[PDB]
Amino acid sequence: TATYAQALQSVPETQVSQLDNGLRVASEQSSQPTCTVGVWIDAGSRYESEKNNGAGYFVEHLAFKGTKNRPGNALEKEVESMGAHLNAYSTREHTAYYIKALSKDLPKAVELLADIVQNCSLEDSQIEKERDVILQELQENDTSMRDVVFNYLHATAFQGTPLAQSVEGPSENVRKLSRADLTEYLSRHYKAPRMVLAAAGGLEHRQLLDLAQKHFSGLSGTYDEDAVPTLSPCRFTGSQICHREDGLPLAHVAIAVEGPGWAHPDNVALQVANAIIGHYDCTYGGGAHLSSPLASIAATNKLCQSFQTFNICYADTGLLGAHFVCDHMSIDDMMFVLQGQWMRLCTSATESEVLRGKNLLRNALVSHLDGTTPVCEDIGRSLLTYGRRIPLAEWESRIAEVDARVVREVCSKYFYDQCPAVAGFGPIEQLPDYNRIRSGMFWLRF
Amino acid sequence: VSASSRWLEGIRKWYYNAAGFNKLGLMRDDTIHENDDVKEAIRRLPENLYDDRVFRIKRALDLSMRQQILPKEQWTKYEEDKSYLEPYLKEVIRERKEREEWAKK
Amino acid sequence: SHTDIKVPDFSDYRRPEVLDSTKSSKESSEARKGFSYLVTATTTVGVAY
Amino acid sequence: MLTRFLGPRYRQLARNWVPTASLWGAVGAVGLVWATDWRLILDWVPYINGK
Amino acid sequence: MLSVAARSGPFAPVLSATSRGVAGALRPLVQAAVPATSESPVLDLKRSVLCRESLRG
Amino acid sequence: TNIRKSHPLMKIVNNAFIDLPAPSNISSWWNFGSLLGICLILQILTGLFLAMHY
Amino acid sequence: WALVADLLTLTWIGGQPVEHPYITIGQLASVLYFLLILVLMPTAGTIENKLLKW
Amino acid sequence: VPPHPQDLEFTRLPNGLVIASLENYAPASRIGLFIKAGSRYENSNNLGTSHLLRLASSLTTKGASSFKITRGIEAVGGKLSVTSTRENMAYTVECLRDDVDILMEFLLNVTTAPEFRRWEVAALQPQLRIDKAVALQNPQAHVIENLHAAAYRNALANSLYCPDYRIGKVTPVELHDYVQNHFTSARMALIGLGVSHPVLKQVAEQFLNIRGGLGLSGAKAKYHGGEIREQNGDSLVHAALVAESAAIGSAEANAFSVLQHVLGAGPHVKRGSNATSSLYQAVAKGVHQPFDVSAFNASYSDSGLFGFYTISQAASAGDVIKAAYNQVKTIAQGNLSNPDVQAAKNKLKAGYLMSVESSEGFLDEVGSQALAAGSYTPPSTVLQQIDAVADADVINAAKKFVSGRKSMAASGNLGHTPFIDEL
Amino acid sequence: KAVALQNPQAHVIENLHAAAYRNALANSLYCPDYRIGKVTPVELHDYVQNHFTSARMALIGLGVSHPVLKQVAEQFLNIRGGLGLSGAKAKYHGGEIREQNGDSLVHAALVAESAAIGSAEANAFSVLQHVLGAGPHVKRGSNATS
Ligand SMILES: COC1=C(OC)C(=O)C(C/C=C(\C)CCC=C(C)C)=C(C)C1=O
């Protein structure tokens, strides 16, 4: 039978075309009877300013509530009535509207996405309606301790920069933000060079282009020339934010050093090292015998309820670390073990565990790209962030290169003797003093 | 089958009587040094064997305190001596040695 | 509403090379650790004497 | 009873901590050299032979 | 069209070695964070939702 | 409740020489620990009273 | 008890001058001490293991 | 320009074991052993045994120890996980394709070599408490659990989670006996993606020739109807209301499937008014605050439950419920447009095709198809059957809900939640 | 609650009432677990105000004299201004509540709506209770009369 090596080659060429526009239009054909189409805009919230902030989110909220061609209620009516799924997200860097549909519906799927992404009828009525909704979201988002701490870690690490901002913005902006503000953001940011039509499933690329030209005709056609700026680089602080609230039953900590961001070859190697540390959850099957020395000790000594390693990327920067959740008398021990892990991997990563991490990463990767929606999202995002789609085989190549040295090196570069950003929330009396955390970022023995 | 392996057996039965844990109602497995491997196998013992084990030791430490010994009747016959711990202890070491090989690669 | 939180401005306490919001802190990182560890190196050097 | 510690990983991990352990004896001896003013060694060092 | 499972109704639990415990199918959770103050159980003596083995390059 | 159990000092004494679980069972060969102690202070006391004149 | 008696032996030798039998017996007790402890007792322990089928 | 696809290959062994594979030429492989051993097969002397069993999937087997399963799998970035419904357990394993050998061996050891050691089992019983705790923090988990507890007397009445009184009480014998009684050949289906049917068949003929529990998918679930109510103070009242529908497979069951989509299941459009959701639109017409309604539709081997699931503020609970129920009653009375029925069909069909897109999803369909049907039934023919639904049958589906002895479960501040009785 | 709820009957008669009525007599003599820690001083205060009024009280004394009682009552127990009615009015509804124990012995009570206390019909039931048989009269007896 097919080797895994063979099996990577079999996965098709992501076909890319450029419109007379800026708009890139990209596709992976598969034999599916079903597709995901949509638009990845290079708008985010790194892109906004203090007065602007939370616009894109207010746009996302407005985006499906009716166009010039299809008023208020009726877009919904069309999508729903054809059994398709309309959806959106924005990040600090990326906005995406996408439809899950029947493949035979890729015509009207594209037709719709076009109408959405240009002809948003931002009716005054609605921007008003939306402001109460968006405020409620803020009130409920305040209850997700995890959602909070990552907003805090962003708020402290990037301290000064647009990246420090939340995607929703502050309460006050939401209440003051006008239609003028919104259309200004819209007309600045929703230009064809800064957006990709992405599709995955049961379609020829030829049809996708035909439809790109048809319905994305003249976006940046005569446009572009005036006051498009590139992103500023974002200063990392490394610094601490401690919001102490003993009324909450468990502590969330999220610790990070500075990442290199999207482009950098080091991401692969860091992701391996991350994979080795891994994640835990109290519902994990079989605890003591877990490979990961963190996760093992965590489970045996009941040192938390959850952890997760991470590497968030932005342009030219990012947050690399871990976040956990635990009892008020665990915050220290959990901190010790996580930190001592990082350092072990910096200094004395053995050969064996790195092969595990490498496999874990391969398994994550293939498994992640499962079916139209993931693959489409990865087409769209990738073209924004790499200017290509990077083929699975290339990732295998990039993974295969890494071994223990490539770990100890790339870990030491990012982790060793570096100021972290700490964010902390809830019953956080025992969260180690910052000096003592920062002491944890190097061994005296080494 | 054998005159001579009945002799190694007679040497063994000698040393058994000579050791003289029997004399305080003890069994060979009552007398084992508690290390981690041993400690766990006591953990793994079923309720009755555990309760029987604690009583044997309790009776013996009592005698040992009063510097006495059982009636010869009440001593533990070499043949009547059950290695109730053996299989557990073996399974523990077996599991540990696995973890130890895995730690090597 | 936890989105109302900004971290207070810090320029007033910040080292000179960590002041531009647009400037990466990675450049100054080596120098800043360099200075402060040389401050502790020389102290030990003095105590050792 | 140290059979335990003989395998591929252990040799990787020793090979990892070797340049460090090298330097730690460099630290330790040169400190003893300086602290005793070892005469025998220090004659070799330019500047420091102050006689 | 079997799998009861995603007939989108009755419950399916998942346990795993690697991955956090799931609870399954359908019912409103859903058109229901849309009109709002669904305040959420977000990390109290708890698991974590989303779940991982879902990273990237 | 008992002063002997909770007073920061008396605590130490009680945990060592009052409420401390010893074996039912240890014999005269265990007496040497304490007699070593008794030896150390007897040596300290006479040793002192000697140092006053030496 | 071979160890105890051997140590008594060495006490007694320590107590006599460095002359005829005293020398050889003293060298022997010296060898015996380091034999009993270093080689003889570990082996004896192991034999009793094999005696208890252990 | 990808591979012209392989077909699924599907084989019934004479012992009644079922093998299906697909060679998608994928870098990863999925293997499921799908057993007829879901929770309905517990009796009142051993409730919870299948939930402990769900958790016990990395305890020591005969020639693969606990430690090795964890390390062996983790070493290859493998996953091993076990999912129960009321009818099935589904032991599925995933990895890179070169690694099917190591993963398969682990899988068969779990499902056919469980040692269930006293001390490992005892060590595990606290985990039913954690596991239940986590799951039972979606108000729906409780509701649908009580909903089943109230509908049936027997079998489907049993909970997917262990009763609190049994936590600490389920035994190694009870575990052992559950495997023996339920994990036999006639009761199993071995499904593989990115493996070849010759290998699957070999594995099956070698290792999965087991039989001598029981035959029947069958105590036979006695529908009874009733209501279970649970005073919360949760501020939002969750409630589900339900009548006996149709057993999965039958033509009538697709009528209900479509009726579900008429009345309306989940949302399609992020933060949408659900213009196409009749239940949502009928309730909105009366009700001016936060709510949710969705048509509820569960379907089992030998029964099913249909109705709807409401979430409202405590005071509106009744208003929501009565609005919802009428709206069904209105379809039973015959007020149902052909383009409505058509819309729900495109909603259902697309949802199906959507549901089988990913490996995890496809494998699950095929697993359960195998156990409920003894077949595979391609999309082309599922949609055909969907298309085959008459406007009338859907009316009649709704007629059946309206006229049929009911089952209710609700939890919250129940002071303005109705009583069946009162609907 | 813990102490009381260790007679299987306590639970049963509690659930029995919970199942019979929709309202009022459905409520439990013991606090719901979800309310433990949650009942407030205001709720307490309000309960006394609403319910501990004159129209709602009876002062009974043994080995005291009626003049004193009356004085105490006219001085100290002139309170009114909750509500009147012994009355939400208890809506009988019927149903069943079942609780899987493993207790080895099944306790069960089965019941229909009888008669309100006071009424003539209520004494019919009182007597019917004694026909069918209440407790034992004779220590370790076969209850020949039950
Ligand atoms: C169960 O074991 C123990 C004994 O019984 C065998 C003792 O008799 C003593 C008595 C110790 C004394 C008198 C301490 C004297 C020493 C100093 C340095 C003040 C201790 C602590 C002990 O643990």
Concatenated DSSP letters of A11-55: S---EEEE-TTS-EEEEEE-S-SEEEEEEEES--SSSS-TTT-SH
Structure tokens at H103: 């993963």
Q: Are A64 and H271 in contact (CB under 8 A)?
A: yes
Among candidates H113, H105, H138, H132, which has minimal Cα distance to H48?
H132
HSE, CB side, 13 Å, CA atoms: give it for residue C46: 6
Can A60 be counted among the known catalytic residues? yes
Chain D environment of B100 (Cβ under 8 Å)? 4
Nearest-CA distance A347 → chain H (Å): 22
Order the strands of the A24-29 sheet from edge to edge. Answer: A15-18, A24-29, A195-201, A34-41, A95-102, A85-90
Using CA atoms, how far residue I107 sits from E5, H15, I93, in Å, is 37, 45, 22
Residue D30 to chain A, least CA–CA distance (Å):
18
Interface membership of A238 toward C (CB under 8 Å): yes
- The answer to whether H1-219 and H220-423 have equal CATH topology is yes
- Residue by residue, DSSP assigns G1-42 as -HHHHHHHHHHHHHTS-S-HHHHHHHHHHHHHHHHIIIIIHH
Cβ burial I41-70 (10 Å sphere, 16+ → b, else e): eeeeeeeeeeeebeeeeeeeeeeeeeeeee
Which of A192, A142, A196, A198 has the alpha carbon at shortest distance from A171? A142
Question: H30: which residues sit within 8 A by CB, 6+ positions away?
Answer: H92, H93, H94, H192, H193, H194, H359, H360, H363
Resolution in A: 2.8
How many whole angstroms from F7 Cα to the centroid of ligand 1?
21
Helix and strand numbers, DSSP H then E, in chain F: 3, 0
Where do the DSSP E strands lie in A221-354? 239-244, 251-259, 279-281, 306-314, 317-326
CA of I38 to the centre of ligand 1 (A): 54
Angle at the Cα of A13 (from A10 to A17), degrees rounded to 5? 170
Looking at the complex, report in whole angstroms how far the Cα of residue E41 sits from the nearest Cα belonging to chain A.
7
Q: How far apart are CA H186 and CA H209, in angstroms?
A: 9
- Can you give the residue ranges of every domain in chain B? 1-105
- The verdict on a CB contact (< 8 Å) between E54 and A364 is yes
H200 neighbors H190 (Cβ within 8 angstroms) = yes
Residue A118 DSSP one-character state? H
In this structure, which amino acid lies at residue D28?
G
**CB pairs below 8 Å between A and E: how many?**
93
Ligand 1 geometric centre to CA of F30 (Å): 9
For helices A392-401 and A351-368, the axis angle rounded to 10 degrees is 170
Q: Which chain H residues touch B102 with a CB distance below 8 Å?
A: 67-68, 71
Per DSSP, A410 falls in state: H
Closest Cα partner for H51 from H179, H165, H162?
A: H162
Alpha carbons within 13 angstroms on the beta-carbon side of residue H276 total: 31
Residue of A nearest to D19 (CA): A446
Instruction: Give the residue from B71, B62, B60, B67 showing the smallest Cα distance to B21.
Output: B60
How far is Cα A56 from Cα A58, in angstroms, rounded to an integer? 5
The single-letter code of the amino acid at A28 is E
Reduce the DSSP state of residue I101 to 3 states and report it: coil
Least Cα distance to A170 among I35, I131, H185, C3 occurs for C3
User: Residue A343: which residues within 8 A CB-CB, separation 6 or more?
Assistant: A415, A416, A440, A441, A442, A443, A446
Q: Enumerate the residues of chain G whose CB falls inside 8 A of the CB of residue B19.
A: 48, 52
Protein fold of E1-57: Cytochrome Bc1 Complex; Chain I (2.10.210)
CA dihedral in degrees (A104, A108, A113, A114; nearest 10)?
A: 130
Across the interface, whether the CB atoms of H165 and I100 are under 8 A apart is answered yes
| Residue nearest ligand 1's atom 7 by CA | F34
Q: Which of F25, F28, F34, F41 to mutate to test the pocket of ligand 1 (most atoms within 8 A of CB)?
A: F34
Q: Any CB–CB contact under 8 A between E57 and chain H?
A: no
The 3-class SS string of chain H reads CCCCCCCCEEEECCCCCEEEEECCCCCEEEEEEEECCCHHHCCCCCCCHHHHHHHCCCCCECCECHHHHHHHHHCCCCEEEEEECCCCEEEEEEEEHHHHHHHHHHHHHHHHCECCCHHHHHHHCHHHHHHHHHHCCCHHHHHHHHHHHHHECCHHHCCCCCCHHHCCCCCHHHHHHHHHHHCCHHHEEEEEECCCHHHHHHHHHHHCCCCCCCCCCCCCCCECCEEEEEECCCCEEEEEEEEECCCCCCCHHHHHHHHHHHHCCCCCECCCCCCCCHHHHHHHHHCCCCEEEEEEEEEECCEEEEEEEEEEECCCHHHHHHHHHHHHHHHHCCCCCHHHHHHHHHHHHHHHHHHCCCHHHHHHHHHHHHHHCCCCCCHHHHHHHHHCCCHHHHHHHHHHHHHCCEEEEEEECHHHCCCCCCC
Q: Domain boundaries in chain D?
A: 1-51
CATH architecture for residues H220-423: 2-Layer Sandwich (3.30)
Which one-letter amino acid corresponds to residue A301? N
Q: In what order do the strands lie in the sheet with H18-22?
A: E14-16, H79-84, H89-96, H28-35, H188-193, H18-22, H9-12
CA atoms within 13 A on the CB side of A292: 30
Architecture label for domain A239-442: 2-Layer Sandwich (3.30)
Phi, psi of H21, rounded to the nearest 5 degrees: -125, 160
Catalytic pick from A28, A48, A60, A353? Answer: A60
Q: How many CB atoms lie within 10 A of CB A392?
A: 18
Give the number of other Cβ atoms within 10 Å of residue I85's Cβ: 7
Q: Which amino acid is at F28?
A: S
Q: Do the beta carbons of residue A96 and residue A40 sit within 8 Å?
A: yes
Instruction: Indicate the number of domains in chain C.
Output: 1
Q: DSSP letters along D2-41, please?
A: --TT-SHHHHHHHHHSHHHHHHHHHHHHHHHHHHHT-HHH
E34: alpha, beta or left, given left = phi > 0 and alpha = psi -120 to 50? alpha
Residue F25: its chain B contacts at CB < 8 A?
61-62, 64-65
Residue-range domain boundaries for chain H? 1-219, 220-423
In Å, how far are A5, A27, B43, B44, B89 from B40, measured between CA atoms?
45, 59, 5, 6, 8
Ligand 1 binding pocket includes F36 (Cβ within 6 Å):
no
Give the DSSP letter of residue I83. -
Measure in Å the smallest separation between the Cα of D45 and chain A Cα atoms: 28
**Beta-carbon separation of B28 and G48 below 8 A:** no
Q: Does H272 touch chain E (CB under 8 A)?
A: yes
**Whether B11 contacts chain G with CB within 8 A:** yes
Strands A195-201 vs A239-244: parallel, antiparallel or unpaired: unpaired
Ligand 1 pocket, F37 CB below 6 A?
Answer: yes
Check if A362 contacts E (Cβ < 8 Å): no
- In the block, residue with structure tokens 């974002």: A234
Q: Give the CATH fold of the H1-219 domain.
A: Cytochrome Bc1 Complex; Chain A, domain 1 (3.30.830)
Q: Rounded to whole angstroms, how far apart are CA atoms A26 and H3?
A: 20
Distance from CA of F31 to the nearest CA of B (A): 15
CA A84/CA A78 separation, integer angstroms = 9
Mutation test residue for ligand 1: of F13, F15, F17, the one with most atoms within 8 Å of CB? F17
Q: Please indicate whether, in this complex, the C-beta atoms of H233 and I96 are within 8 angstroms of each other.
A: no
Class of domain A14-228: alpha beta
Q: Comparing C-alpha atoms, which of A204, A262, A239, A277 is closest to residue A44?
A: A262
C-alpha span between I126 and I25 (Å, rounded): 20
Distance CA C25, CA A236 (A): 6
Q: Which residues in chain D are contacts of B101 at CB distance < 8 A?
A: 7
The CATH number of the domain covering residues in B1-105: 1.10.1090.10
Per CB-CB distance under 8 Å, the chain I contacts of H226 are 95-96
* Separation in Å, CA D14 to CA D9, D11, H31, I15: 9, 5, 40, 69
D8 reaches A (C-beta below 8 A): yes
A14-228 against A239-442: fold identical: yes
Distance from CA of E32 to the nearest CA of A (A): 12
State the first-to-last Cα distance of chain E, in angstroms, to the nearest integer: 36
d(C-alpha A56, C-alpha A446), whole Å: 48
Q: How many CB pairs under 8 A join A and H?
A: 167
Phi, psi of D40 (to 5 degrees): -50, -50
Angle between helices H379-387 and H338-355 (to 10 degrees): 160
Whether D6 and B103 lie within 8 Å, measured CB to CB: no
Q: Would you list the domain boundaries of chain A? A: 14-228, 239-442
Helix (H, G, I), strand (E, B) or coil at A324: strand
- Which chains pack against C, by 3+ Cβ pairs within 8 A? A
Q: What is the largest CA-CA distance in chain B?
A: 56
In the sheet with A306-314, reading across from the earlier edge strand, the strands are A239-244, A421-426, A251-259, A317-326, A306-314, A279-281
CA of A206 to the centre of ligand 1 (A): 92
What the block records as the tokens of H156 is 């489907």
Q: Which helix (H) or strand (E) holds A206?
A: helix A205-215
- Per DSSP (E only), the strands in A125-272 are 195-201, 239-244, 251-259
| Mutation to test the C interface, candidates A48, A158, A159, A416, most C Cβ within 10 Å | A159
Query: Which residue in chain A is spatially nearest to D15 when comparing CA positions?
Result: A348
Q: Of H192, H185, H191, H186, whose CA–CA distance to H206 is shortest? A: H185
F30 lines ligand 1 (CB under 6 A): yes
Each residue of C29-38: b (16+ CB within 10 Å) or e? Answer: beebeeeeee
Write out residues 67-96 of H within 8 Å (CB-CB) of E. Answer: 69-70, 73-74, 78-88
Q: Dihedrals φ, ψ of G17, to 5°?
A: -70, 160
Q: Is F22 in the pocket of ligand 1 (CB under 6 A)?
A: yes
Tell me the CA–centroid distance for residue G41 and ligand 1, in Å: 30
**Domain of C39, in residue numbers:** 1-49
Place of tokens 């493998």: H78
Location of structure tokens 């709720």: I43
> Rounded to the nearest 5 degrees, what angle is found at the Cα of B97, between the Cα atoms of B91 and B99?
105
* CB of E31 closer than 8 Å to CB of H294: yes
Say if domain D1-51 classifies as CATH 3.40.50.1100.
Answer: no
The burial of H312, by beta-carbon neighbours within 10 Å (0-12 exposed, 13-18 middle, 19 or more buried), is given as buried
Contacts of H69 (CB under 8 A, 6+ apart): A286, A289, E17, H58, H61, H80, H106, H109, H110
Taking each helix axis as running N to C, give the angle between helix A74-81 and helix H338-355, from 0 to 180 degrees, rounded to the nearest 10.
Answer: 70
Tokens (6 digits) for A55: 């616009």
* E43 vs A contacts (CB less than 8 Å): 144-146, 250, 252, 305-306, 325
Question: Could you tell me if A64 and A129 are in contact, meaning their C-beta atoms sit under 8 angstroms apart?
Answer: no
Q: Which chains touch H (3 or more CB pairs under 8 A)?
A: A, B, E, I
How far apart (Å, rounded) are the C-alpha atoms in residues F31 and C34? 61
Q: In degrees rounded to 5, what are phi and psi of residue D39?
A: 20, -75
Q: What is chain A's Cα-based Rg?
A: 23
CA dist., res. H190 & res. H208, Å (int): 9
Count CA atoms within 13 Å of residue A198 on its CB side: 29
The Cα E21–Cα E49 span in angstroms is 9
